[PDB]
Amino acid sequence: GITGTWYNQLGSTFIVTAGADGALTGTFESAVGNAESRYVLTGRYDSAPATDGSGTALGWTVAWKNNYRNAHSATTWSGQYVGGAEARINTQWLLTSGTTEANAWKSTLVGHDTFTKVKP
Amino acid sequence: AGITGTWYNQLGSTFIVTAGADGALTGTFESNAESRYVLTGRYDSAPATDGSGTALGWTVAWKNNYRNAHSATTWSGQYVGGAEARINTQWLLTSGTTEANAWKSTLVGHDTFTKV
Amino acid sequence: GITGTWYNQLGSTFIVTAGADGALTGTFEGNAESRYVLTGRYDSAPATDGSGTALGWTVAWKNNYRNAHSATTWSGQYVGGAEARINTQWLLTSGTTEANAWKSTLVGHDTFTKV
Amino acid sequence: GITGTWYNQLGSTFIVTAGADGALTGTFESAESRYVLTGRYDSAPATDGSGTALGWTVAWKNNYRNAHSATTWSGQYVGGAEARINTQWLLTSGTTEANAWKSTLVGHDTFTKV
């Protein structure tokens, strides 16, 4: 299932609980970036996925502020859980930083993260 | 913070959000009940003081008690205050797919929200 | 439709020719040092149902004066009419080490008009 | 290092020539499934361990088929014994204005020489 501890391809740690109501809650600890210790995440998932072989859609957000550091930025991951012998969460993400208007054209990074229950 | 309240895009969508003291975003995204969905996200509760906007993001899973599109959208963006306050976002909509169809699982776009 | 001089919302200038084969060629920039080659493709036989015309192009940010070790691609569609528009999304990738590849790519959106 | 034949994991192949002036020219085979490719690359990349920035476009029209769409790939070439082109891509379809909000898919793809 979705609930558990997952790792992306860089070794970041995603600790998430899927609630009966469609909620995602937990913590994220990034292996890269202007980031240290755990950050709060919240998100949503499809609690009644199709029964045709399709994955389970989900998304979550981290704002990169905790008690230690503040990078004035937020990542959102949008993707799907794919069950199976080696379960995976396949995502694309958008990181936006707060910027001045003059710098807004370069406010947003895009990437892709794949999560498994094994750490690199 | 200036975020709490009702925001509108230019395509007929509304949401309603509360920006908690703790960096939480909670609320609803709509157009009637069949068009309303739970939203949850996070924002920077201590933004820079150099004129920069406030980073934030949120998720809607497109499931409610009336329908289920087996999909989710995330909006990632920044709040800009002032005379003309705005939330400027880019978004990713992922649908559940089979692995054979995963290449076509995700739409990307942009949307700007205003208070009027 | 597509051939002409276009401007985005930040005042960049996109000078393009749409060839009979599907080719796009031109320059993206007022000074010489800020001018770069672009090349791309478009749908030379779009639908006849009111839909736009799909297209895309690339600029590598190297010219005879400057090199940013980066390239942008714009993907979008041409919408004709009294006020023609090209609506795009873009990806800017900079060369990075492997370790840094997660932060290689910016994304945005640009709208072009002939004014 | 870019000139030659590249493969993904989904059955696509392309052949490209990286010209001395920064041009990319070639053909992309999706699977009558061959299409013109054109783009640009950094002809004077750093030699510091960084990749070589590049991009290209395929409009999905040939003499047989037309999807009324175009993909752009933006990425970097990484050389060495196991060379790769790592990309993110945008596929835009021609749409009416009412449907423009759903005109563009996004994804990623990696190409190899083997």
Swiss-Prot record, chain A:
Subcellular location(s) per record: Secreted
Avidin-like domain mapped to chain residues: 1-120
Protein name: Streptavidin
Source organism, top-level taxon: Bacteria
Record function comment: The biological function of streptavidin is not known. Forms a strong non-covalent specific complex with biotin (one molecule of biotin per subunit of streptavidin).
Binding site for biotin: F28, Y39, W77, W93, W105
GO molecular function: biotin binding
Motif Cell attachment site per record, residues: 44-46
GO CC terms, sorted: extracellular region
Organism: Streptomyces avidinii
Keywords of the record: Biotin, Secreted, Signal
Membrane-crossing segments per the record: none
Subunit structure and binding partners: Homotetramer.
Residues of the whole record sequence present: 40 to 159 of 183
Keyword set includes Secreted: yes
UniProt similarity note: Belongs to the avidin/streptavidin family.
